[PDB]
Amino acid sequence: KVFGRCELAAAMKRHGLDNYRGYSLGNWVCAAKFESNFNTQATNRNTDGSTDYGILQINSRWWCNDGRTPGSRNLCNIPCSALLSSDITASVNCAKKIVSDGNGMNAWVAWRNRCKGTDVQAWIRGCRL
Numbered sequence: 001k002v003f004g005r006c007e008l009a010a011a012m013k014r015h016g017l018d019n020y021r022g023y024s025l026g027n028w029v030c031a032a033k034f035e036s037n038f039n040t041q042a043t044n045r046n047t048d049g050s051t052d053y054g055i056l057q058i059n060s061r062w063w064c065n066d067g068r069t070p071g072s073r074n075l076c077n078i079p080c081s082a083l084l085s086s087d088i089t090a091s092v093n094c095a096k097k098i099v100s101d102g103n104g105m106n107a108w109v110a111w112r113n114r115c116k117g118t119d120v121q122a123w124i125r126g127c128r129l
Contacts, residue, residue: 001039001040005029005127024121027115049069054080056091063078063097064076065080
């Protein structure tokens with residue numbers, strides 16, 4: 001695509017993600033950055049044969065269905081292709097569920113290895129709320 005630095009910060013915002021269970025808007029921004037480089041169409045197969053889907057790289061073995069990962073559950077009751085939409089709502093919604101799963105933002109490798117415990121706000125500096 002891809003998405004824009006502040007295009008996203010603003011898009012995640014009014015989807016009510018800015019302080020969502022503690023996590024400043026900046027973390028999601030920074031998460032999107034490293035998981036997919038703001039590419040909504042991003043896809044990545046893991047070793048277990050599963051595939052990571054979308055801007056926040058959401059896995060098929062749990063949250064979304066792709067008819068290609070046996071022994072998987074589709075926890076967000078949604079097909080994985082809908083996560084590849086330029087519309088963000090699907091992705092955000094399913095993300096919101098992943099953060100309250102009990103383990104928080106740590107559910108993203110990229111985040112807790114490139115965002116966590118760092119100045120996370122610089123990611124939304126200058127952007128129009």
